[PDB]
Amino acid sequence: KPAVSVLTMFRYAGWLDRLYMLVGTLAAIIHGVALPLMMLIFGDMTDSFASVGQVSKQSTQMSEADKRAMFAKLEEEMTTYAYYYTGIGAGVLIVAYIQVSFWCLAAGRQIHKIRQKFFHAIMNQEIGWFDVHDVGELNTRLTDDVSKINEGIGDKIGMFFQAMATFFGGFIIGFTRGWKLTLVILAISPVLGLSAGIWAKILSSFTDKELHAYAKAGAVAEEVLAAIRTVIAFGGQKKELERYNNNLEEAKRLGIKKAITANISMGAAFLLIYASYALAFWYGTSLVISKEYSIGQVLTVFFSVLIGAFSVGQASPNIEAFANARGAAYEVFKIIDNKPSIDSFSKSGHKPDNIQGNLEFKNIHFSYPSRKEVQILKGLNLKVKSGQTVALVGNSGCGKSTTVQLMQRLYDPLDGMVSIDGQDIRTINVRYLREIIGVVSQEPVLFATTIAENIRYGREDVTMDEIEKAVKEANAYDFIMKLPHQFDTLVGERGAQLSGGQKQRIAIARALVRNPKILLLDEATSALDTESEAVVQAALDKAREGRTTIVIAHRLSTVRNADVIAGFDGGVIVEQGNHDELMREKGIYFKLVMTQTPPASFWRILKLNSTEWPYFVVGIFCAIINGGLQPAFSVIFSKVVGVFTNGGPPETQRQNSNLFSLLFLILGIISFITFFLQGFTFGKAGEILTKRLRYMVFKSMLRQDVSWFDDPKNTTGALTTRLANDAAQVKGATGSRLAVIFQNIANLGTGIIISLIYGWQLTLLLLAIVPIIAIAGVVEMKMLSGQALKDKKELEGSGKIATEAIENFRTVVSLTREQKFETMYAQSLQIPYRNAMKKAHVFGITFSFTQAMMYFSYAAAFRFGAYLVTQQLMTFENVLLVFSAIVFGAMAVGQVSSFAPDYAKATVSASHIIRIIEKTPEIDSYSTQGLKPNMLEGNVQFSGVVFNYPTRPSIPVLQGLSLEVKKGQTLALVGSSGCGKSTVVQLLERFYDPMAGSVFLDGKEIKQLNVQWLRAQLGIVSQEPILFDCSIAENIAYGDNSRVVSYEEIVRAAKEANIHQFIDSLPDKYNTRVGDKGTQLSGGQKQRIAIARALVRQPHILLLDEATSALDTESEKVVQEALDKAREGRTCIVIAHRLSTIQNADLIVVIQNGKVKEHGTHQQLLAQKGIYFSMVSVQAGA
């Protein structure tokens, strides 16, 4: 919404930039006017053949005389028009270079200025300015918004004025050469602007419907793929597939309905657009039979008006480009023009010499740019004598640090003054102020250069002698000499990451070259290892005694040797003096001392598409028809002008033009009959394979074992995204692009035969001409993208040192040296600048030479056309036919290069979608093999089980584990921490097979058992029960699949789980919907339902994985009261973290390091005094 004044945006154009834009936009208007003149001459060449085509047919008496006066008219006329044509092509050769080169010159020159000025302004902002903005957004604003300005002040403006020139020049030649046809072509323009306006309404309303259609199927997939371990546990893998398949049937029906309506929209749109042209050209013939216009003039205005009418649309993007460039220049010029109060670039203020360093803070009230919400200093008083070292202490608030901020004049105080020596800090130059103040902060930062360069950021003029003395005087010399490369080592966020106390000493040496008169030490010793602390503290004490120092820390070890100590309480200075005196004061200071003591040939995706052997052949056949049917419209146009230039007797003409105009309206309805079929057939054929793909993909996804969904590469979001993209892309590869790529090769294929057989070698010329200008247009775009990628590579090096500059900026401004980054960034930009000058000459040459090859080509179209072919018996009516046939057959192949990324984008989406079907798991739930034993009672054997999770094969969770539980017994399971408690349940569910050892149930190894049958006698109940969006009756009936569960049977389970209080209390009862979509209810109810569905199954084994994890108050008392009833009649394994409820367990087992450590009944393990005795004592006391 905000924009910029049109002059202020070009504020950096002067002298030459103003001239380049003028000569550029001048030649840009010359370039535009050339094309309607190029069509003006096309009309005069018609009358030349027309004055001869009418007299050649008017004879029927003399033949050698028609070889004289006729051919003489031609060679004087044709060579006159051919001379003009070659001149127009030489004209656009020059002006197109002048056009694009100059504007890209003016843009390149300005954008170089924008950048330097804009980064300059970023570094000139006071710290209170950054405290309210994001440096991340600002940096991205620096590289993106400057790019948008370049796009709007570049060759796009020259293009804008080229288009308006064709618009004006088109309707000038339109109006002047005839005021009737123009008003007629403008009358059908509302119809053309109304037919394309139906597409802005159908697309935007149906692209939502499809995004609302699959959103109903993707919602099923997401609660499934998020609750996958619950559907795997209960084996709903057939239902959740079926339910996803039931939503795929509706999206197919809504996709075929969209395919019906959208293809009706295109065909009727073209047929209205092509009828609107017909009537404008038929009614152009109706005015030549009346002898008002010539057959040549009808062509001139008809083209010049349509050319001029369509230049309106070819300019609208450049308007938007210039407009986006204005609005983007707002927030950028806003920074450049914003003048600060502090500067730090200002060359003003006093530079006191012989600074003794007597500092005082008087009545300083202050607040950070959070402003009225918080006031951190409620007045202040604090001197510090020269040479002394004051120490600031405080419990919280850190108004301690605030005095360091103010002393650097980072912010000015709200009320009061900070006085270095006798002068207010605000009289002294801000730069000289920060040069006479060294700073050592809590987090040290070193810039991505050498040690000598980081030390050189203290002073730019320095010799390794003084670097050596500085690092040696901050005892930081002994420890870099051992480090290789000596002073030439690297530092940064990338490479050679050093110790904290090591990084601080380089900062002290950096501040030591500064030889400052003032010293500010904020938190420098805090947050650092204890041993290297003393090494740095030795340097801090050696960095003082020659200076006056204010120090802030929480280490009460560095404060004793301070001459004076200051304490705060609510921003108020409260307690000051020497160490011994504050201890006698027994106040705030004393109170704190005691406290601290792969692209490839994928044929099979088409082989799966071969499920529909028809539907394609219906479309292909129907597309080649429409392909062959499309040059015939040019053949009709050739003969509507042909027989009416080759007329002779004018009486038979009016009756044939009526017959031709009737044919084309029959030929367009049969084109709309054949266009609708080629779209509907692929539309239906593409939507039905989208079901087959998404069906087969979602199937093989439920096939994979838990080992695959734990992969951080495959999350629930990344799987539905992989589910929707890969199936939509392959539809596009086999969809519209294929119908169009076969329509167009039939378009040229049928047009190449018609033209070839009329004009002998006439067509053989254009086939030496057209493929060259098409290749020349493609190599231009390859050079376009090459210059684009190369410039991105070398401006990000500039923005990389800008990134380092602006998000490490509160440090650099403390060090001054903004002029450093100022110059580095300037040297960084000098390469893309001198590059952008070549870009102007490159773009200008390529564009001018793809434009010249269009007019020189069309100069050669009439070079054969006349002279060598017209001195022969071959006719004019065929030269017009070959021009329209070949050039339009060529521009139809120009659609092949546009649909190229649609093929590759799908093959890569196909690359992943064929792999995801064929990938087989270690533990496939689908295998029907397995024992399916007959005996009911259930035991459980773990025997020497070692197992690590495949995601993290580092820390073992189970190693040498061995358990056993009898039927009807409760096996408690206590663990120090981790999933060692929980991994047991996962292995009994055979989520994974163990690495070593084995797990048995009824005496049989589950690893040889049926995977699905095993999970069928297991009553899993987790700590967060997930319930799908459907009836609670179904959430409860979900526990027993392969059979619909009776109402009174899911009632009996709801009776067991003690959830039946709600299940009658709700208005819908069992038919109520849960899933945070229909109704919401707390976890205690969610949980009981999970218990309900757990024992619908009537398992022989319950599995209670910390079932009282997230639960409170009476809700825990009622859930355990249900769990305790659900067991005792079944084999039970409970790992619940409530050891109170675990007392009445038939066997408790303590897990230690994966090994079983301590087992026995409660009082047994309680008689022993060890881990279980401590596990129970720690929770009972606390």
Ligand SMILES: Brc1ccc(Oc2c(Br)cc(Br)cc2Br)c(Br)c1
């Ligand atoms: Br009759 C008649 C035939 C083609 C005409 O222009 C064309 C041409 Br030329 C090519 C195609 Br494809 C469609 C149309 Br509409 C006109 Br205007 C009138």
